[PDB]
């Protein structure tokens, strides 16, 4: 088994001003079953994330041990940590987010039949087969109770078996028999070896009799840390008798709860510094210290497997809540046949340059425009994000990859097909055959680079308040410099250089030279040469050398390896922002 | 006090299929303190909401009646319902979160010293000292923790003193003394008259002993329901002894679970409908039955006052976090500097005219195209407006018009005084002092009008990702008829509508006939004209009616009230969307 030993752990909160949340606190958790009991702030929650290695090591001032060794990289895909406060994803069901669970925390030399016979036997032993295929709620569509989204929260980390076992108050939202019901689980795990830690609240005396050790927290302070049956002989010999409750549990935490105004005020040299005075005098503090002094990434699943469960159920959440890809579609069609209803017939003409380059600004600015959609890519789940790093079901780059997926297949390669396809069949364009895959690559190109760039502001980021404010803010910088209405030669050699940074600058220009190769304007023509008075612009061709472009096929795709280098670019500054943001 | 009496109840949800929570459930609560026990998924948080009116009639096939007669309006506004997973704002303090809950659900017939010693009071009663001046904890920011942030969810509706008072599971989240602390303060209130309803899970026998009348809940039927000192008596003659169990309600709570499957795994003619039957065949529902049949808005505080504490709150988290109101100002002074530096200069000559009509336009799709961040104002506190207007704090027309002012003050009006002060001094524009204004009005209008199509659209939504989207590509269908790129006049008949629409068409033309009275571009001239060949564009009046403006006074204003239009309709549509939004 595991020996878990924290020794000497501080900690410390800057609001600045620090505050000292858990002062010296010393203890061993053999395997067994162990409990954590205390007052509400007592720093039961913060005494279970340093244990679980996810408090921010800038404040803790201890060190944790597993069996007389410090931790391994190799933590979180060997340990388990129910959280408080539920962090399950709620447009899937119970039974898809312990699939979910068991398909990256176990091993692929389990067959897929054998995680869903260790998932319905988890399902089984928990009490949720009347809502095993019901959804989990959100917080505006009702589901799944709490306490049963609780077991929800308690089976995930139980489906991949882990040795050192954490669970933050798994029987707070659960009645006094689902409650013993749980704990006689992990009663029955706990004999096999496994080391669970564990804060409760309320325990009842069938639950309180299954404890092996037993700590007692107060006030960031322990009162008490040993065997839980020689807990209720330790407070007699302090002067606290035991028979006016019938349950320990009951009289333990009315003894380091004393001092509370809450119980002063109701029906009734401080109280804490006397009780952890008591215990540091005690033989239960000289028997942990004296075996303190004596004691003192590989992530389970590989890449390919986690970027195709990522994605997989990314794909799942869009054809279940199809609201924005629906809505995409229908107003890039509406958008296609107006752009295509407005520009009809592209005539040869005086005024026929005008018409097929202001329509080509509009199809670039479309794609750049649109991009600020996924912004809300990595926002709406960040939490999930957070938490199921930690727990360790993917790396970084399998949730990023796979995340990119689902946003640059539903949202930017196929509104860039049907938006080129609607726009040649009624407009006239360039007639070619590869002329039209040439438009319909380089729309793709400008819808991936702003959403790269919509990814670059936004990747670890809380709200999209801000992202969405620098995304359309940039744009209308770099629609400035797109070369339409401001002549790129005439802007100043100091702000010349900004035209580099366009996203619309460099599709703008390749579906200019695509379409204005050797098209003719000026046919139709008198006997001498046109007369209109510009004077004309016969050719195409005429017309990119006043713009400034490359008449060579490199001044086609000069553009294409422009934006396909701001994409690489800007979707290593949106991995690095997801890798190095704070998760603890 | 006040009887609540619920009759033939029964509950419905679409999951299309229906399931039946809540079968057939009958009872009276009396003025005293009123349990529900039972397993989890038992209906006790679906019959609480339907007892505190916050379940959609649609499904409800029952009458709840407050002292036999029907709910008032009227019942928000004096009742209050502790909500089980603590919908609380963390961007305040529990003493902030507790002075916005009586500054709005207690009259201002008590001043504010008045509100704040029975603030002070509720915070000593319920333990909250340590805290009191702490920041409520959000979902990435650590605050409060989560007992702590349950007591200023209990303590909330409870400076406001309601007579009838829900509470879904008050104790969940708190130890055995806090626990028996917070009912010791509901029974102390209790023998004031009010009626106390709430659901609990474990309660010891110093809570158990508290009650006063005791409900049974299993899978949505009926146990039992009537005193709590007559309920053991009760099992003992359906054959269920007690003396294996100290605690009453740890005994009523394993017959009533007996057939989970959690509790026949785990040391182990239905159940339900067995003991079901025999409640119904009992005395204690003849009791019931033969009563239930002998019974069978004008908010608490105005309209001001309430809109001066939405709006008060609503500055505090924008001076708190002002990531988003100082990323507006710092990318509106950079972008002002460059369009005034690229545009630097601007002169009287065959191309000074492609430079003002080519700067005003993106002067107005600035304005317009940075409205898109005014879409998360409704979406990220959905839930909390969601709960604080079913618990009655205000009206929707003051939560309506207090955010506004939080929107159009820091990020609306200031980034256009800014925006066109920068422009004036470095582009040399009009000279005059009233056409400063004028466009400085006039770029106020399309941010106002294209941010109050930001909230028409996403009013009452749970993302902003169906929003943003409509939200940018609706800009460029309206960037299209602005009148820049393609000749407004050259439209055809059946296109030339839409652009009455365009927010960009109005500010454009405002911008252009503000600047372009009788500026003069052709002098500097030959004997004989001008001798460029367009031919020219002397003046600024030739240049309005190319364009089809109007030259009289009514030609600038008739683009202010048209885009003045757009902001009544706009935010009465983002009105109804609130007030039409389904908070059941
Ligand atoms: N990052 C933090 N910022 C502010 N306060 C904190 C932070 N961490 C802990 N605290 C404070 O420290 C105390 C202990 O917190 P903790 O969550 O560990 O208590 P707890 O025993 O888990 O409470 P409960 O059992 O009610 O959840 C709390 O009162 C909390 O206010
Ligand atoms: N709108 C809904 N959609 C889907 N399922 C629902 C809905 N409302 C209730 N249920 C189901 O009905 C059962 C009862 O729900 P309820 O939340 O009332 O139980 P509870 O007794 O409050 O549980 P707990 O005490 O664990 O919170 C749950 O199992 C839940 O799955
Ligand atoms: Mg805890
Ligand atoms: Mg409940």
Redesign the interface.
Known sequence: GAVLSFHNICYRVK?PVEKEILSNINGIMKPGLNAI?????GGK?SLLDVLAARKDPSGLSGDVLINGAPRPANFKCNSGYVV??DVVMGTLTVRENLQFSAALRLATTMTNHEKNERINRVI????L???AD??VG???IRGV????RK?TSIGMELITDPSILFLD?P????????????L??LK?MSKQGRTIIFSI??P???IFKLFDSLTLLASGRLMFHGPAQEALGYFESAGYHCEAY??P??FF??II?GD????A???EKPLIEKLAEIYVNSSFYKETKAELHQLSISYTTSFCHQLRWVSKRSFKNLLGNP??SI??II??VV?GL??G???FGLKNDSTGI??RA?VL??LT??QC??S??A??LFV?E??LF?HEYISGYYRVSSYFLGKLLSDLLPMRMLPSIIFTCIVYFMLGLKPKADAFFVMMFTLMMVAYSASSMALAIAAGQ?????A???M??????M??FSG???NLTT?ASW?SW?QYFSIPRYGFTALQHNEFLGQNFCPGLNATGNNP???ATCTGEEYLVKQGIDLSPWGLWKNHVALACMIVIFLTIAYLKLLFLKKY
Not at 37 to 41: C, K, M
Not at 260 to 263: C, D, F, G, L
Not at 472 to 477: A, G, L, R, S
């Open positions: 609001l009991l205390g007052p509400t702030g929650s408080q406060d089984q032993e928990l009490g087969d009347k809502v019901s959804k959100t917080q505006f109770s709490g306490g049963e077991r108050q029987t707070t939202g659960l009645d006094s028999s689902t409650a013993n019901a749980v006689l689980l029955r609240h309320q009842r005396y069938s019938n349950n549990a009951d935490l009315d709860n509370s105004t809450a119980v005020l109701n029906r609201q924005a809505a995409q107003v890039t958008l107006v752009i209803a407005i520009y005008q018409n202001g600004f509009f600015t479309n425009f649109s600020v959609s912004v809300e709406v960040k939490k957070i809380s709200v999209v308040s801000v969405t404010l620098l359309t803010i940039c744009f209308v910088f629609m400035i339409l209405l401001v802007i702000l900004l008075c510009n004077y």
